[PDB]
């Protein structure tokens, strides 16, 4: 119903600097800082109160929806050391210490990459702080020795001055780091004095330098939460992109266009010639957010250039980090290859290079269980990434994608890896499922009835007097092609018109093939168009377009012409007439653009038709590859012409062309045994 | 000057039923008819007076510009028998009789086909009528015996009832015929009671049946000439077609458009589903007038169908007469093959059959002196028919044709064969030469100066910084291509614009080839367009079209695309902008037609470009023939789209496309060694 939509809208108008689950680990360090003015106790007890409030039934601390030793142990350690250092509420320390001691051994049995960032860097400092309290603690553990060895390895791996000159990710986790400067390192924080926007690093920093720039930041965050802090703040750009991405993939973006373009222009104003980070001011930038923003901004008529990607290339390779070549995960390259589809022909080839590198890197590991990310856990990655690597941009239909994603969006059941298991709900909410699924279900139920309506219409016209193989399957497929490009209820007019004239042209093409052609013509077929229920105004235009199509049928005879582009042009003209829209006065650029679009459509149709023709003759595949490249070029070109926010022509008028061409390419790029499958899944196979 | 034009216009508004040289032979028979009311003398003495007035210095009768025995003798015979039968002015009979007697022998030395119609049929009756007067006459002559033998041959060749039932040409010359009926033959005259619209046959007919329908006809003709009659009357359709044909070929038709379309709609109203004759009411119809009218009517947006030609086909042959298969002359098949060019693709193949039959029949006899007609004598047929058989419709430029015809139109120095040497001046006048030649000469002198203007412009721009082989010849050829499609002085704007942007695109294409392509791009060439002198309004549109062409240049790279259709589309757009015209509101049919034209142009350009490419590689000629057929089909189609008088779009907007495509085909269908020849002949080689 609507209430979900309205709540989501109002919550979406209220985009703050961030919405993430409040962490406890960092709060514990916040408690460790005393009162500034030589006070008697800690700086802020609100954190303390928050801590006492949320003692687990097993005394632990952390998200209950999951169970992770490496994180529970650190949360418990930080809490117990904080409260007992300040020597208060010792009973809770006792309550948790039993679980601590009895769980001390489970750590040796963890997963491969489920290893928190600097996890082996804080834990040493953790037990160090502990040995001042020095309770009963089995410090004796080979796991401790292993992480110690890795500590020494990475310490021998890191420089001193490059570390003191070049701002790197290590500044995110510097508290477990020692043996440092405070002036050469002083300037390597963010615009707000935060080091990598992480509160723990800055808190430990202020512990050794009273720069008010850190105090004001922390005070603001603790004064905006009143007990509790996250592990990273803020995440404006991150959530901004990641919400609109879902709302596009969830097929509900039809309603929130205003707020959508609001966050869009925000990102645009904050766009850099160098890349993007989770926040506006973080100097170090990564590739994944950059690519995602690139894709989304292009997809809405914003002029950007992709040579910014020339920073994440590594001399014939690509690595998500700028300066670090570590084995990347699936998601960054996934979004990269995705954004690598909408290439405009006037752009540098770095996009193509990244595309081929990415597809190579992905297809191999696809067959195995390599879909495990190092920094997030979702419901089902493999299916999504597989379909993505399967159905290119030119063969993508919106409804089938949203249907597939309806079982691949996890909602709340996800977690995000950081220094602690955190989760965001602003865009990982679950009411999104209710809204989208209700919408899709009613949409299905509407398509179901209009289907039978069209069925009885088609039977009334006795069109099978010159039918095909069987009218049922083909009429189903035809109406499905229309329904898949337009799902809004208020356009069933254009929907049914499309389907009807499609069936018509099919029938007459069949009849013409069966008799040989227009030399064997006998009947007045320019009246056959009347079989469509006509309005008062929509009559004459259609008959004119129909006679035009017939004249084309005449002229295309005796030659080696194809007969498809004619049909596509007829289709777009008719869809427009049914949409009841005109063009304006027609300054020369306007009709120039129009004719350009039409010529592109006709050419593409002829080309891929001939390709299919050769495909059926067992032709040598190299020819198929040649023709595929050929259609690809003008495909990209047409897309660029449709996606220009500077166009003088209307928008819907543009996307119509896309609808038709995508329909044709799709139906020309799959066996029916998949088409019917998709058909039943989207129509008859019901949700909820 | 203008006075010639105005006189020709006023004379052309006054189209009568016919304008032909007055004959004397038929007048003589008119004199032979007595007064109807049992009068004392002949019916009309005005003929007699006319006769006495025009006694030749040698007493003979006939056109002095020529000397033909077979006709002079018959004229003299008819005159002397008439005047002396009525026994008046005998001295003139004596004056002519000496030449008669001394010339009696020259007849045995005539030409092959220079044999008047029924010449051997009237002469027997002539000497028969003479032997009543029976003066000194050497009736003894072997030539008389030869024509007598042929008389008997043809008399044994002709039927009786078919002759009495089927109206045939013999009804034109029936006076030398005897042994006849007067009722079964009675109905075989024209609508006006005239037999084949010839006065002699009808006069001899009334001699044996006093049908007033003949008396009124003859009275009208003698009352409209007041002394003297032709050998055939009237010739409305004949002269109507034959004048506008010249005015089209003479390149002056620009001025008389009104009267032109007046006679056109006249012919249209009088158009039959069966064919045409010299006049409106003659039931027997021939092929030559039919084909000529067909061609001219189609060439002005009139919808006619050519199955009317299925009457003149003879089971795999064609013969000008319907029912008679006699060895045809050059002219009828010449005009037939000519009209056989503008074939619309939706038509029956009778046109193609006639085309191949005609070209076969013509090309052989071309090499010999077979250009002699049996019924007319012109200045130079061979050159004209040769050029026609050489340069097809798709390779025809108007100016070169009018220049060639300026030395192939004889004017008055021609004669027309009938029962007597007759001549028409309404369309064979000579002031037409003065007007056309003056026009062409001033046109030449204007082109000469604008040439130097463009020369100094092209030098000012230093365009040769990236030139070609040599700028002179190529710039000449380019400007020539423009000047040859537009000769009106008031369009030098479009002329120079065309030439300038042509030179531009040539230069940039050269530069792009020389550096490899747009990957090696260095300069901002979308500013290079500024080098043209721009107006206030014509600036922005051109820069837009130019950047469009550049984007095309970008997209067409790395593929097997051609780069010609882009240039042609740029050219037409620019010519239109310079012409300063828009399209209207743009109802869907309008822009539909527009885009159709543009797509056709692009396709044709690509195709013939690739053809030329293969041509230079010594490719197997069969491929060239295949590609030639391929371009031919869409060539015909495009022509049909341009020549539709039902179009919603403007006319000039249409013919522009034709101009461009014809330019391209022509330049792609001749060695330069002919191009430069034509160039000098039309520009530097001066008329008068």
Swiss-Prot record, chains A, B:
Keywords: Chloroplast, Isomerase, Magnesium, Metal-binding, Plant defense, Plastid, Transit peptide
Motif (DXDD motif): 286-289
Phenotypic consequence of gene deletion: No visible phenotype under normal growth conditions. Mutant plants exhibit increased susceptibility to the rice blast fungus Magnaporthe grisea, and reduced capacity to inhibit germination and growth of lowland weeds in paddy soil, possibly due to decreased levels of momilactones and oryzalexin S.
Family to which the UniProt record says this protein belongs: Belongs to the terpene synthase family.
Residues that hold Mg(2+) according to the record: 286, 288
Organism: Oryza sativa subsp. japonica (Rice)
Intracellular or extracellular location(s): Plastid, Chloroplast
Name by which UniProt lists this protein: Syn-copalyl diphosphate synthase, chloroplastic
């Amino acid at each position: 119903t609507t209430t979900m939509i309205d709540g989501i809208r109002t919550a979406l108008r209220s985009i703050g600097e961030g919405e993430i689950s409040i962490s406890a680990y960092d709060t514990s360090l916040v408690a460790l800082l005393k009162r500034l003015d030589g006070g008697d106790g800690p700086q802020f007890p609100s954190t303390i109160d928050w801590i006492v409030q949320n003692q687990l039934p097993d005394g632990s601390w952390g998200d209950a929806s999951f169970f992770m030793m490496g994180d529970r142990i650190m949360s418990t350690l930080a809490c117990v050391v904080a409260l007992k250092s300040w020597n208060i509420h010792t009973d809770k320390c006792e309550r948790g210490l039993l679980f601590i001691q009895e769980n001390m051994w489970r750590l040796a049995h963890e997963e491969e990459d489920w290893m928190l960032v600097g996890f082996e860097i804080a834990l040493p400092s953790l037990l160090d702080m502990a040995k001042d309290l020095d309770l009963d603690i089995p410090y004796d553990e080979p796991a401790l020795k292993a992480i110690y060895a890795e500590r020494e390895r990475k310490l021998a791996k890191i420089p001193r001055d490059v570390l003191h000159s070049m701002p790197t990710t290590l500044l995110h986790s510097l508290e477990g780091m020692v043996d440092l400067d405070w002036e050469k390192l002083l300037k390597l924080r963010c615009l707000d004095g935060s080091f990598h926007c992480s509160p723990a690093s800055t808190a430990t920093a202020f512990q050794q330098t009273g720069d008010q720039k850190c105090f004001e930041y922390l005070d603001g965050i603790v004064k905006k939460f009143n007990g509790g802090v996250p592990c990273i703040y803020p995440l404006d750009v991150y959530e901004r992109l990641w919400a609109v991405d879902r709302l596009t993939r969830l097929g509900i973006s039809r309603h929130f266009t205003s707020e959508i373009e609001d966050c869009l222009d925000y990102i645009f104003r904050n766009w850099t010639p160098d890349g993007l980070a989770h926040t506006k001011n973080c100097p170090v930038k990564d590739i994944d957010d950059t690519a995602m923003g690139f894709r989304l901004l292009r997809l809405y008529g914003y002029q950007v250039d992709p040579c910014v990607l020339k920073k994440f290339e590594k001399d014939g390779k690509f690595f998500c980090l700028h300066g670090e070549s570590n084995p990347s995960s699936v998601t960054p390259m996934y979004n990269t290859y995705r954004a690598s589809q909408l290439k405009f022909p006037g752009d540098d080839g770095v996009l193509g290079r990244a595309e081929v590198f990415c597809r190579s890197f992905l297809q191999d590991r696809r067959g195995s269980n390599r879909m495990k990310d190092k920094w997030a856990i979702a419901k089902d990655i493999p299916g999504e990434v597989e379909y993505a690597m399967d159905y290119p941009w030119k063969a993508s239909l919106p409804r089938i994608e949203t249907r597939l994603y309806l079982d691949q969006y996890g909602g709340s059941g996800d977690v995000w890896i950081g220094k602690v298991l955190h989760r965001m709900t602003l865009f990982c909410n679950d009411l999104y499922l209710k809204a989208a699924k209700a919408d899709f279900s009613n949409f299905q139920k509407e398509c179901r009835v209009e289907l039978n309506g069209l069925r009885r219409w088609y039977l009334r016209s006795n069109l099978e007097k010159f039918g095909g193989t069987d009218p049922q399957t083909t009429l189903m497929t035809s109406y499905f092609l229309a329904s898949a490009n337009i799902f809004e209820a208020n356009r069933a007019a254009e929907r049914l018109g499309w389907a009807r004239v499609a069936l018509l042209a099919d029938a007459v093409s069949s009849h013409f093939r069966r008799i040989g052609g227009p030399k064997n013509s006998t009947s007045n077929l320019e009246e056959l168009i009347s079989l469509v229920p006509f309005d008062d105004a929509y009559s004459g235009s259609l008959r004119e377009a129909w006679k035009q199509w017939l004249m084309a049928w005449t002229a295309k005879e005796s030659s080696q012409e194809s007969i498809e582009g004619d049909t596509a042009i007829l289709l777009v003209r008719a869809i427009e007439i049914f949409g009841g829209r005109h063009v304006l006065t027609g300054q020369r650029p306007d009709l120039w653009e129009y004719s350009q679009l039409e010529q592109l459509t006709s050419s593409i149709c002829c080309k891929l038709s001939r390709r299919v023709l050769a495909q059926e003759n067992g032709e040598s595949t190299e020819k198929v590859e040649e023709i595929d490249q050929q259609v690809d070029l003008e495909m990209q070109e047409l897309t660029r012409r449709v996606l220009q926010g500077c166009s003088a022509i209307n928008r819907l008028t543009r996307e119509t062309f896309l609808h038709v061409v995508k329909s044709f390419c799709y139906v020309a790029y799959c066996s029916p045994e998949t088409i019917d499958s998709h058909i039943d899944k989207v129509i008859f196979q019901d949700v909820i």
